């Protein structure tokens, strides 16, 4: 139907918006901490810690197949970054610093995105 690639293409321009917004949000990790999954042959126990683990390469595969339909969900897996470090490592490590860090300077960003997925509809 007309109406399903109306929601198509609406579906395209909201995975452009938050690849952009990806993007700056991995610019805020240089150190590129968040950039892959934590591996599980150098961290064996993780799954034992870490029940829903998340990193940008998996958010970015995701987003390619279109997986995100809405900013909650793409926000949902950003936190998942930030939240499984903060409790994996502790508060004297660079792994937590990086991802303190990485929250705030995120916040701006994931503000305005909001703005302009409601404005842009």
Not at 33 to 48: C, G, M, N, T
């Amino acid at each position: 139907s007309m109406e399903q690639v109306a929601m198509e293409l609406r579906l395209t321009e909201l995975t452009r918006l938050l690849r952009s917004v990806l993007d700056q949000l991995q610019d805020k990790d240089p150190a590129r901490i968040f950039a892959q999954p934590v591996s599980l042959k150098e961290v064996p126990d993780y799954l034992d810690h870490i029940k829903h683990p998340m990193d940008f390469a998996t958010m970015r595969k995701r987003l390619e197949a279109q997986g995100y339909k809405n900013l909650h969900e793409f926000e949902e897996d950003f936190d998942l970054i930030i939240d499984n470090c903060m409790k994996y490592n502790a508060r004297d490590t660079v792994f937590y610093r990086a991802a303190v860090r990485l929250r705030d300077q995120g916040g701006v960003v994931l503000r305005q995105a909001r703005r302009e997925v409601d404005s842009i509809g």
